[PDB]
Design a protein around this ligand. Structure first.
Ligand SMILES: O=C1O[C@H](CO)[C@@H](O)[C@H](O)[C@H]1O
Length: 459
């Protein structure tokens, strides 16, 4: 069985996670630059000051992608490189724009389709200081829309695949709910407000795209949402209901508004006044505001009722069944275990629920303890190859067999990189990086994926 010729595959990265050169060519700080200077926030006390030095080694990264035979490449734009201070009235940075324009043109020359994420968490710090970023409704919406417009104008004739936001669930929960990610806020209200404003900022950017650029540039625009596949801990009504509630707090609170036109029932009932209400005009704007369903997924979880964390929807999630059996192979992060079947079930679920072509914008695995391995051992990344073997198979079945409309798959990540609060200790690349020399060494998983997609995409 083979995926249609139109299917695209490749790898994904995020600007702050790989670029480095934090103040080069006019770039000003993002909230993540600030966050990494706060003690105790990053596990290994690192930052994205250097990362994989991909801002400078952008050419090398493109050659690497080409050598892998990818059909596409997903990367994000550092907002503070394009508009350093971020605002609609702030000075635009020609050098930053040119950098990305040149990168995209190299991708075009190499025949690699660019998938561009406008926002992958690096909000310009000036906006946070000016009005609290996403916390301010009208300022955040106008500035993001202006930023999106500038991006469409600057790269739109070469880019036909846009992603507004990368995981608003993470942006809101981790950044404003428990303070684990930048800007490190902790509140039972801000996460819901930030989420609301992002849904609106997203919708404004999409309407702008469709109305002023889509016809001439012939592209599409969507949002990337994260979601694991969730399975009831047992077959009791409490567990089944808890699973549905968990899906709402993770995915439904974003997908139902954007694809169906309203916030789901449970969360509104639970959060009450803390969950903002869309006005009739906002609902209209938001409903149907995504051309394709961008999905980032990594594992499967068992769900039980009785959780005490409101950010999770008052449920308990884990990878340990009632009989003690684990879902799958352990990775470097406790919550993430290998479970291919869940990927297949999730793809079908999403296609049926939201009726938009699915693009898996992220899927990968961090080999447990790989950071301690020398390059010659790290390249034999057995567990990562097994993960991709299981997940690509789930993908093949979902489309060709089950009938789920899935049109893209991007592996996270092209390179080992800065894994946010975990620092550099968690390795997700199909390519090993020696941070002391910046030398790139392909791991065996890279050979597996190149070979698998070559053999499973119609010629
Ligand atoms: O979903 C994700 O998982 C990746 C691995 O945790 C992380 O590096 C990306 O920034 C994030 O988008």
């Amino acid at each position: 069985a083979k995926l249609p010729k139109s299917f695209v595959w490749g790898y994904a990265t995020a600007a702050y996670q790989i670029e480095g050169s934090p103040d080069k060519d006019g770039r000003e700080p993002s909230i993540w630059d600030t966050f990494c200077k706060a003690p105790g926030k990053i596990a290994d006390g690192s930052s994205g000051d250097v990362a994989t030095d991909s801002y400078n080694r952008w050419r090398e990264d493109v050659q690497l992608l080409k050598s892998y035979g990818v059909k596409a490449y997903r990367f994000s734009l550092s907002w503070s490189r394009i508009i350093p201070k971020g605002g609609r009235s702030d000075p635009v940075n020609g050098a930053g724009i040119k950098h990305y324009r040149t990168l995209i043109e190299e991708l075009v020359k190499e025949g690699i389709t660019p998938f561009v994420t406008l926002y992958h968490w690096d909000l310009p710090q000036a906006l946070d200081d000016r009005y609290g970023g996403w916390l301010n409704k009208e300022e955040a919406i106008q500035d993001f829309t202006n930023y999106a417009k500038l991006c469409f104008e600057s790269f739109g004739d070469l880019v036909q695949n846009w992603i507004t936001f990368n995981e608003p669930w993470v942006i809101s929960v981790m950044g404003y709910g428990n303070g684990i990610f930048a800007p490190g806020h902790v509140s039972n209200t801000e996460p819901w407000i930030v989420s609301h404003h992002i849904i609106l900022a997203h919708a404004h950017a999409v309407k702008l795209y469709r109305d002023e650029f889509k016809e001439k540039q012939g592209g599409q625009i969507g949002i990337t949402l994260d979601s694991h596949w969730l399975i009831p801990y047992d077959d009791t009504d409490a567990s089944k209901e808890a699973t549905l509630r968990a899906m709402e707090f993770k995915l439904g609170r974003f997908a139902n508004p954007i694809y169906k036109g309203e916030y789901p029932p449970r969360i509104k009932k639970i959060l009450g006044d803390r969950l903002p209400e869309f006005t009739p005009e906002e609902i209209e704007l938001v409903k149907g505001s995504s051309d394709f369903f961008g999905l980032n997924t990594y594992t499967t979880h068992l769900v039980q009722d009785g959780g005490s964390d409101e950010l999770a929807g008052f449920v308990k999630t884990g990878h340990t069944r009632a009989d003690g059996t684990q879902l799958g192979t352990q990775s470097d992060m406790g919550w993430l275990q290998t479970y291919g079947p869940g990927f297949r079930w999730l793809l079908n679920y999403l296609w049926k629920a939201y009726d938009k072509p699915v693009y898996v914008t992220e899927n990968g695995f961090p080999v447990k303890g790989e950071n301690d391995l020398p390059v010659e051992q790290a390249v034999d990344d057995t567990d990562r190859q097994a993960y991709y073997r299981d997940y690509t198979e789930a993908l093949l079945q979902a489309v060709t067999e089950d009938g789920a409309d899935v049109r893209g798959y991007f592996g996270w990540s092209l390179l080992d990189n800065f894994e946010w609060a975990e620092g550099y200790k968690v390795r997700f690349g199909v390519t090993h990086v020696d941070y002391e020399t910046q030398k790139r060494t392909p791991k065996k998983s890279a050979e597996f994926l190149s070979r698998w997609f070559k053999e499973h995409i119609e010629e």
